[PDB]
PDB file of C-alpha atoms in Angstrom:
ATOM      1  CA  UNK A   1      -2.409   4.980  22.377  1.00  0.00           C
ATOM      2  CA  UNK A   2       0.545   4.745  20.263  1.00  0.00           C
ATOM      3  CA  UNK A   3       2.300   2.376  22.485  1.00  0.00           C
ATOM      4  CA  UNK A   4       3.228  -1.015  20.748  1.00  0.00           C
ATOM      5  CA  UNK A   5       2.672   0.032  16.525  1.00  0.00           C
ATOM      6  CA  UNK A   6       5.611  -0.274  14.475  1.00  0.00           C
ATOM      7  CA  UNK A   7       6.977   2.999  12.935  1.00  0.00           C
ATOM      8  CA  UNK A   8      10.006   4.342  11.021  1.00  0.00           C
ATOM      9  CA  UNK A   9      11.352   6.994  13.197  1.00  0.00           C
ATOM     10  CA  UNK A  10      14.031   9.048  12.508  1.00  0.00           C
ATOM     11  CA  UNK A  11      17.582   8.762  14.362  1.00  0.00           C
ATOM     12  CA  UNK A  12      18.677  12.164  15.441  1.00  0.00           C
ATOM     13  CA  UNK A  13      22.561  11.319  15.007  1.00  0.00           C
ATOM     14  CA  UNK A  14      22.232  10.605  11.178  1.00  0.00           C
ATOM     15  CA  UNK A  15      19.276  11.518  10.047  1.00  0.00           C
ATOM     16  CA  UNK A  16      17.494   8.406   8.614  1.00  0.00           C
ATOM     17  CA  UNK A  17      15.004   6.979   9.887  1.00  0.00           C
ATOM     18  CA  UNK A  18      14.599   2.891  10.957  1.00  0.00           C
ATOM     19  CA  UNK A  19      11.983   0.619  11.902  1.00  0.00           C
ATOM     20  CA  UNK A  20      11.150   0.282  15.268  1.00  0.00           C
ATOM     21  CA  UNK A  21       8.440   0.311  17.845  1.00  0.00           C
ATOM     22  CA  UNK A  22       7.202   2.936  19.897  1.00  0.00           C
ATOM     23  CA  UNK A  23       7.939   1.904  23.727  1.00  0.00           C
ATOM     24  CA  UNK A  24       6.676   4.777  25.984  1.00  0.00           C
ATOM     25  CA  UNK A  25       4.522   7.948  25.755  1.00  0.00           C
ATOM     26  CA  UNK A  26       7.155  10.238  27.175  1.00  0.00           C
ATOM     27  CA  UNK A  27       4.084  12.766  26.901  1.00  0.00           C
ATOM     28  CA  UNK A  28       4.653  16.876  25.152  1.00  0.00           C
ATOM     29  CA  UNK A  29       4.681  14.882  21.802  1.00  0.00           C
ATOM     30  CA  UNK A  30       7.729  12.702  22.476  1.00  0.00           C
ATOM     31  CA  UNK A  31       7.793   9.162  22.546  1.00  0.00           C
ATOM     32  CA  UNK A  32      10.392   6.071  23.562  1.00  0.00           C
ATOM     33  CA  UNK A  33      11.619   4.181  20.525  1.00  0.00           C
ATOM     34  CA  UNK A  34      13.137   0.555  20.606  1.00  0.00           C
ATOM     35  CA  UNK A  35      14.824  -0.026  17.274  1.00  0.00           C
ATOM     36  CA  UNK A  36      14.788  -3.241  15.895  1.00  0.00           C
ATOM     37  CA  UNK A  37      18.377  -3.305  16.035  1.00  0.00           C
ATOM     38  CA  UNK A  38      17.618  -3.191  19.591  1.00  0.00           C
ATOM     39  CA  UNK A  39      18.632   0.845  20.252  1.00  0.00           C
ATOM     40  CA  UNK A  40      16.653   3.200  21.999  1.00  0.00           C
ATOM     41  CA  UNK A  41      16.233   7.075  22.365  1.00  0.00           C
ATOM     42  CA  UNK A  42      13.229   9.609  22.408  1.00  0.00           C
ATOM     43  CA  UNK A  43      11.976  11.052  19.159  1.00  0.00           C
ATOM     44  CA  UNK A  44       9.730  13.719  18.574  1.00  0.00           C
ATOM     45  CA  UNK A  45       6.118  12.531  17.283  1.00  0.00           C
ATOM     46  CA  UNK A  46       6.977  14.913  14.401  1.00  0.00           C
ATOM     47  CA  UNK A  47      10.074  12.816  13.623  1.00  0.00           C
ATOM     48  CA  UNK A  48       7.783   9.138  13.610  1.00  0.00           C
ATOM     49  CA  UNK A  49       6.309   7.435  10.748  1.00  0.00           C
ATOM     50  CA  UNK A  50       3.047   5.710  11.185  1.00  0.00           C
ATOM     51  CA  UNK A  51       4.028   3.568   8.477  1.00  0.00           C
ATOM     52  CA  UNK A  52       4.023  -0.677   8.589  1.00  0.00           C
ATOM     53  CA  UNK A  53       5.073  -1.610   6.058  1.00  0.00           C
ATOM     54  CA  UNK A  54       6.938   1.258   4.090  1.00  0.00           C
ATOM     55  CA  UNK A  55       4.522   2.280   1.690  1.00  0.00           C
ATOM     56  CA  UNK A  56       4.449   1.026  -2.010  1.00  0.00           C
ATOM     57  CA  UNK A  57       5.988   3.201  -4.910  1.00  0.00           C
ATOM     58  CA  UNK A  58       8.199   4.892  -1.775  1.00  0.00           C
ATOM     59  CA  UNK A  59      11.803   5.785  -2.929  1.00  0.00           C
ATOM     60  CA  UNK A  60      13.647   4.023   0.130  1.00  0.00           C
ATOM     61  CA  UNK A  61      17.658   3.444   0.616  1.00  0.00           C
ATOM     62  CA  UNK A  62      18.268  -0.715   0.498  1.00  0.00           C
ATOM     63  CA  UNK A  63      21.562  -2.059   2.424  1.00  0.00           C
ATOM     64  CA  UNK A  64      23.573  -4.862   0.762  1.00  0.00           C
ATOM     65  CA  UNK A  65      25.590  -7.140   2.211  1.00  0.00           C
ATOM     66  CA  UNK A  66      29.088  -5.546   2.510  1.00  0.00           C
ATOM     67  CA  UNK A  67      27.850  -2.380   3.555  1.00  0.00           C
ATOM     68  CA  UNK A  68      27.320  -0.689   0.195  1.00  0.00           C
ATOM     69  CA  UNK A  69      23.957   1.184   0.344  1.00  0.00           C
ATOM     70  CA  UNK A  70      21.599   2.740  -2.828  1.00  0.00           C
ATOM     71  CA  UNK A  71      18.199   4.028  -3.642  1.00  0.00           C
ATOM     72  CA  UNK A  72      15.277   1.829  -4.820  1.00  0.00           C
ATOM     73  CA  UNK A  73      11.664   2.128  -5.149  1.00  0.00           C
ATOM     74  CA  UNK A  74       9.424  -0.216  -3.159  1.00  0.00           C
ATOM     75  CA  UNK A  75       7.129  -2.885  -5.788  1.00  0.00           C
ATOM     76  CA  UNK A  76       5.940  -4.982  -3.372  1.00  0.00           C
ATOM     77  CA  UNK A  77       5.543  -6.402   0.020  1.00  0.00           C
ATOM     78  CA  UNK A  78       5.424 -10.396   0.986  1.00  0.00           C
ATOM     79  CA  UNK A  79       4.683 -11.986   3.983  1.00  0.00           C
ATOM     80  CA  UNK A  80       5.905 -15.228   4.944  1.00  0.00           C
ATOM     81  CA  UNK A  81       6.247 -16.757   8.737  1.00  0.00           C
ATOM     82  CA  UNK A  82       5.040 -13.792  10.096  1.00  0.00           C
ATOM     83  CA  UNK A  83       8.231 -11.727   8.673  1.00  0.00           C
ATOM     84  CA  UNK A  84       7.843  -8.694   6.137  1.00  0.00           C
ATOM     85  CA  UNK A  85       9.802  -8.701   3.103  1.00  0.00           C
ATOM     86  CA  UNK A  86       9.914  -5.931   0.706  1.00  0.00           C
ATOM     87  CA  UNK A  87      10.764  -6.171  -3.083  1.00  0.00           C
ATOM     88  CA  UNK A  88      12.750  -3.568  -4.106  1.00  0.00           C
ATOM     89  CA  UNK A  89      13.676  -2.058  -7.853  1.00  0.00           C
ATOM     90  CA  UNK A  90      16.645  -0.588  -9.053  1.00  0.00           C
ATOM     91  CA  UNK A  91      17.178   0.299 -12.577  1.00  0.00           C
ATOM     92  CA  UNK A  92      14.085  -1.956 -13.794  1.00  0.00           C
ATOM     93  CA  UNK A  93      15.457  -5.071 -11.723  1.00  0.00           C
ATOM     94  CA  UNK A  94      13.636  -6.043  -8.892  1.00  0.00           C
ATOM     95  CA  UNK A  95      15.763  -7.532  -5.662  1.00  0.00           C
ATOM     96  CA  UNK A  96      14.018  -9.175  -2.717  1.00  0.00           C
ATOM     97  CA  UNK A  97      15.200  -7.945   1.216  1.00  0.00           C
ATOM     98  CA  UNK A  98      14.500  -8.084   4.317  1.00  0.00           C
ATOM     99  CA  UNK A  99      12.924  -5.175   6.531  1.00  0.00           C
ATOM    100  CA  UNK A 100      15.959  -4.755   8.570  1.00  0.00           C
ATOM    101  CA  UNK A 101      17.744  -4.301   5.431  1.00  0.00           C
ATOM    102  CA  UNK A 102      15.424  -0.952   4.178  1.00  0.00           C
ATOM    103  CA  UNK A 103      15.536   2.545   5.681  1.00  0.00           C
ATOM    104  CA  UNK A 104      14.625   5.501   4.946  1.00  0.00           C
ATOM    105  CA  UNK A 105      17.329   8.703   4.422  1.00  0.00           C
ATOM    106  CA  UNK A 106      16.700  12.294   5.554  1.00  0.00           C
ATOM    107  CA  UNK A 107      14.851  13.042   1.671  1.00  0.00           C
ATOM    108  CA  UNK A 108      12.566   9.966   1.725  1.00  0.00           C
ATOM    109  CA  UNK A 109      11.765  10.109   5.289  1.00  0.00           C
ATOM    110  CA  UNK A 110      10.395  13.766   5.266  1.00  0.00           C
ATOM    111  CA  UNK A 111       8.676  13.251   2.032  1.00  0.00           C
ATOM    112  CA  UNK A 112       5.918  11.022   3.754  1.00  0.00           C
ATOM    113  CA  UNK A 113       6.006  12.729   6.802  1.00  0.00           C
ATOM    114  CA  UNK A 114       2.589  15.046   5.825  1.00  0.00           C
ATOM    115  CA  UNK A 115       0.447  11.868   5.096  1.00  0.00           C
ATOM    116  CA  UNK A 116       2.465   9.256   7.502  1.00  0.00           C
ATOM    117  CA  UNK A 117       4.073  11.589  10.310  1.00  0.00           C
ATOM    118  CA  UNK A 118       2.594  11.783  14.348  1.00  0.00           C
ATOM    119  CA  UNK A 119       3.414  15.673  14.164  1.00  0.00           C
TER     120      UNK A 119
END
């Protein structure tokens, strides 16, 4: 089952698609997501990313602190005390965050949906 893995599924209302975890088989090829930002809805399988963490050399969309947003490409992944943190470039500087901090926007989500998606 699918039930417990950590995904980046899409969120119908804007497109772009967060981390989560996949709660429920709601069966027909939908599933319950809870969000790490602790929302939940049904997404299709097609619309879920069996991706943990966010692959390297992905183009993602980092958040800064005062709600500015931009694209970066992912260099690296660190673990420390069991948390994920992703190292992300822009313009040939590199910028530690968070994985609450990196999503994924209707472009870069569908691009890895062939290799990544639960379609």
């Amino acid at each position: 089952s699918f039930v417990g893995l950590r995904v980046v599924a899409k969120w119908s209302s804007n497109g772009y698609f967060y981390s989560g975890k996949i709660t429920r088989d709601v069966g027909a090829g939908k599933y319950k997501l809870l969000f790490d930002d602790g929302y939940e809805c049904d997404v299709l399988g097609k619309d879920i990313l069996l991706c943990d963490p966010i692959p390297l050399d992905t183009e993602v969309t980092a958040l800064s602190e005062d709600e500015y947003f931009s694209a970066g490409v992912v260099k690296g992944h660190r673990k420390e005390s069991g948390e994920l943190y992703y190292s992300i470039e822009k313009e040939g500087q590199r910028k530690w965050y968070k994985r609450m901090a990196v999503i994924l926007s209707l472009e870069q989500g569908n691009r890895l949906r062939e290799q990544y998606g639960l379609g």
